[PDB]
Amino acid sequence: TLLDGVSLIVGTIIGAGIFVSPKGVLKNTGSVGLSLVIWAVCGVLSLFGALCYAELGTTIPKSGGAYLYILETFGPLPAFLRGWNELLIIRPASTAVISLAFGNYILEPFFPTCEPPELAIKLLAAVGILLLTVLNSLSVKWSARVQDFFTAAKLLALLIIIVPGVVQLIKGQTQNFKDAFEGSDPSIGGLPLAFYSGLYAYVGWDYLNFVTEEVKNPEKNIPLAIVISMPIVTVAYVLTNVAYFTTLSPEELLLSNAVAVTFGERLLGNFSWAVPIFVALSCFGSLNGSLFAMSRLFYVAAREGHLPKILSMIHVRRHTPLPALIVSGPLTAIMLFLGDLFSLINFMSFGTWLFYGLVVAGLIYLRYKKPDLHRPIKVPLFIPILFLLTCLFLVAVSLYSDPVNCGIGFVIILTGVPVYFLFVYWDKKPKWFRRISEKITRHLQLLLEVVPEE
Amino acid sequence: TGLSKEELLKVAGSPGWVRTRWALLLLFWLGWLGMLAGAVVIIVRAPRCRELPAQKWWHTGALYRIGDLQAFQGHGAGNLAGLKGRLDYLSSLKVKGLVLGPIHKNQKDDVAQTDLLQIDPNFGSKEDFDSLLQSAKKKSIRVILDLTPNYRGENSWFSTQVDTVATKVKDALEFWLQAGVDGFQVRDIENLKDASSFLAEWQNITKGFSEDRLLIAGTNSSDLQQILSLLESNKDLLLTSSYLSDSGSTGEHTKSLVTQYLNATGNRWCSWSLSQARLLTSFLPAQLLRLYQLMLFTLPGTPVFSYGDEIGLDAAALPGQPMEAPVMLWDESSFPDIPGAVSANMTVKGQSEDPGSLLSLFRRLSDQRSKERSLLHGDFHAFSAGPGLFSYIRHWDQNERFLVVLNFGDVGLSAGLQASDLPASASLPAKADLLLSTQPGREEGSPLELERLKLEPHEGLLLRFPYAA
16 A cells, blocks of 8 residues: 555645745745755655655564654653654644644735735634634544545645646746746855755655554555655645746745735636635645644653643543643644744754654664664665755754744753653652642543543 | 543532533633634724736836837848847846837828838838747837838928828728737827827727727927827827926926926826937936936836937937937947947947946846836825935835935935925835945945935935835
């Protein structure tokens, strides 16, 4: 089921910043062909990451350890350095950016003369998130069907941009906009968020690699699925860019808005129907995905024994991990409050580069000392090494680019560590604390209507 | 313990938490709904950005006039291939289009022989011009044909009967439609049997052909009110006029001249040219010329020049060619009539090298207008300023603000900017991002403090601001 695995990662993960990253690489570069190639490079890096994740899966299949395997190589403490921090950082930042992108899309058809100010973009986005946690709290299988509805519309959301782009391609707009170009930069300029941003659009696959390891197929063939799927993504990126340079002009892409709407404005007839809520539906699918990712990981932390089981668990009425969803609410709300999409991206930028850096660092180390990683595909350490090298250099430059949010993000990452000590390795938890924690959680469960993580 | 036992919770399971939770739930989605309502009313209460008021061809970009093919090409051959090469030059200029000179069989003061339709073969065949027009379209160039039926002769309107050719105009509208020409330049009106009716007529005929096809109402008259009456009959055309040459070399006068133009124009389609169709480079010298280039371009309207204007082609000052039959010395190489007495600064090549040249000044200027939606369309508010200081607050027809400050003549003037004459909609920031300036040493790109702005000899200042309204 390798091609199944491919659809499970390309029909799922993709376009988180598809209407963000255009200007996210254009305003961050100047070429502009090389900024499209950024999207290509982003894909290449995700290839490398995924291949490394596959190697890790075969190296240590043990616990299921989507990253717990690197803990098995680095120890337990790094869990919060890694996972908890992703929960702090990436999950809700991406949730926020996506839902804010949603809000942006939603404003603009009713404001189609200029990019609208902070309005429903944040308020509605929050409302939407809360709605989605309600939908998720409704017996998960329903939210899954709702996500299926998202997902089909999502894989129309791509097409409502790309296919019109193809029409323009057929017209020959590529030649009309052939003045976009590529070159070379001896000084090696650019800006890391741009370099992030394609990866931002397609990230999460990273862990779905372990899902494909788990999925009924030879583990030796999941690299093949990986190799197949990555160029599909870069093709989609190119096709997306085609639409952006054959329907839209380079200048229109600099209008700082949900270019889906601007794109729609360039289409004939009732273009609101040409570029409909599929964008919103796309967002919602990915938003629920991140909400479930968070709630799932909250469950996992409880299973690790680091987190109180009350923050999962049903909620018999629906049989869903509402407490976990409840935690994810505020977690995303504050990221929505932050708003600024690229600073939200800065936080994600570190997190990814550094965390995936840990994955490949482990495999590099192990190959040098304590090898037998059980490579499912005949690839060298230059896959994890070159990946690592891009990613850390991007860390350094991005730090320089925005040492405020970059500094903060890094600090948050560091403060995964002492938190781990609070959750595990703490000096002494008070008895009365335990007593009231039981009393309080009892009351909370009495409110909830419940079955605890068994 | 961080969790209570299920069976313990079933001991237990009182309404005090069960119904309470239900109440809390009601409150939960109630609050959610309140938030939802907030999200709705905040966009209901939110204003909407100005719905971007814009015309095509009118009040936009720029156009340049072609008469003789040889002249235009700095030729020589005077062929259509040379013109086609110059179409790429045009695109480097970022000009919207051009006015094809009187290609049709113009006569030596003969209204009967004149073909406004049929092409004079001593420019080429229709098919040659069709491929020309096609390549122009491929290069995003709009072409307008100057229908002066007696171009070959003395009086462009024969100094006699014009109804014969009036019919031929109509017929030519179709002949040249078939060729592919979206408009026709019209000259001196003073010699026409109520051209205002003819232009209303023909323009509407051309309107039938396309919204679109634009005739150009040029005149050698300076009577703004006659010009107005021409506009009363026909708003729809592009105007050029000696009225605008009334500017002379006086700055505040010209400022009011502009105001007057706009007053008569009202809210009609705007256009700018100091002359009907004369090299403005032959009319006035670099000092003021380069300032007028910028100025006119930066006035509400479609600025229209003649070819040679962007190269500083003062044919009146160039042995080998008269103002009346100039040669566009755009090349090194294009000087047979004045061999070696003209530098590369006349040519586009040395002018490309020279960032302050009319060529490069214009190119930069047009580069900016292609992006500046406000330069394209907005209210260039009459900002008053000291003697020789032109100034305007460009109110983008949405939300972005610009300031024109033009130091007319070679005088070391101070800012001299009356900020106090502005309405709230004009209000204006002090950080004048310098877009363009005609004495190139000035910090282009810098947020020039207006209240500490020093002006220099022949110094235009196209400035950029956020929309402090």
